C-alpha cells in the first residue's frame, strides 16, 4: 500500500544484528579465503553488498559452495575492511590502506567505495 | 577504528537487496507456516527483527529446521504485514488490521511495532 508508516532506524538496527550474528558465528554459511586468511560470513549479506558475490551466489553451481577462494592478488586486510563496511556502513579508509581497499572494491564490484577512494586519492594529488 | 567514514544509504540499500532476494526466492532457507499459509524467508533477517525468531534460530535443534509452524491463533495477514515490515521498514497499519498486527507483533516480540500499535489504538479511544 501507499498508507505505510516507516521506522527510521529499522534498516540500521537489522544491519547491527546481522553483524552481531557474524561476530558470534551464528548461521554463517560461507568462508571466504583470501590467501592465508579465512573470513566467515552470510551469503545474503555478501550478495546484497557486492556485484561479484551477487553473481557468484546466484550461479546454480556456486550458490551451493561453502568456501569461495578469491584471486591471490587480493589483499586480506583490504577484504577485511570491506567486509566490515558491508556489515556496518563504516569504512576504515586510511593512507596506508586506500590503494588495497580501492583495488579490492573494484574486484568485489562495490561502486560507492570505489568512488570515495578515487575522491580521496584525487584530493592528495 | 574511530577514523571511519560512513555511507548513509548503505543499510537501507542492503535491506532493499535482501527484499529483492526474498521476492525472487534466492537463498531463502525457511518456510514459516501460519495456518494454511506459507511464507519463505531468510532465517538471519527473521532473527534480526524478532525476539521469537532470534530465540528459535539460536536453539541448537531448531536452528536446523527448514519449516517453522506458528501458533494457530496467529493471523496470516498480520504475519504477512510484519514480514514485509522486517524486509522494508514500512508497516501497512490500517484500522482493519491493527488488532491482528499488534497481536502478531506481541507474539513475534517486535517491541517498536507493538508501541506504534498501542499509540494508534489509544488515539482512537
Amino acid at each position: 500500500a501507499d498508507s505505510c508508516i516507516q521506522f527510521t532506524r529499522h534498516a540500521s538496527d537489522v544491519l547491527l544484528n546481522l553483524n552481531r550474528l557474524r561476530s558470534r558465528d551464528i548461521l554463517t554459511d560461507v568462508v571466504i579465503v583470501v590467501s592465508r586468511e579465512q573470513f566467515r560470513a552470510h551469503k545474503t549479506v555478501l550478495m546484497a553488498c557486492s556485484g561479484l558475490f551477487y553473481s557468484i551466489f546466484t550461479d546454480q553451481l556456486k550458490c551451493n559452495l561453502s568456501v569461495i577462494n578469491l584471486d591471490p592478488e587480493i589483499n586480506p586486510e583490504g577484504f577485511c575492511i570491506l567486509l566490515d563496511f558491508m556489515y556496518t556502513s563504516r569504512l576504515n579508509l586510511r593512507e596506508g590502506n586506500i590503494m588495497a581497499v580501492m583495488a579490492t572494491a573494484m574486484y568485489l564490484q562495490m561502486e560507492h567505495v570505489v568512488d570515495t577512494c578515487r575522491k580521496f586519492i584525487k584530493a592528495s594529488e | 577504528a574511530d577514523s571511519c567514514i560512513q555511507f548513509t544509504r548503505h543499510a537501507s540499500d542492503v535491506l532493499l537487496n535482501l527484499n529483492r532476494l526474498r521476492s525472487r526466492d534466492i537463498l531463502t532457507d525457511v518456510v514459516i507456516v501460519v495456518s494454511r499459509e506459507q511464507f519463505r524467508a531468510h532465517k538471519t533477517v527473521l532473527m534480526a527483527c524478532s525476539g521469537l525468531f532470534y530465540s528459535i534460530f539460536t536453539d541448537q535443534l531448531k536452528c536446523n529446521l527448514s519449516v517453522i509452524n506458528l501458533d494457530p491463533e496467529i493471523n496470516p495477514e498480520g504475519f504477512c504485514i510484519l514480514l514485509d515490515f522486517m524486509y522494508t521498514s514500512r508497516l501497512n497499519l490500517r484500522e482493519g488490521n491493527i488488532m491482528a498486527v499488534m497481536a502478531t507483533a506481541m507474539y513475534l516480540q517486535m517491541e517498536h511495532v507493538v508501541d506504534t500499535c498501542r499509540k494508534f489504538i489509544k488515539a482512537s479511544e
Binding site: 508508516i5 516507516q6 521506522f7 527510521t8 532506524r9 | 517498536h112
Partner: peptide, 5 residues
C-alpha cells in the same frame, strides 16, 4: 521513531 515515508 516512526514517520510518514
Amino acid at each position: 521513531a516512526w514517520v510518514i515515508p
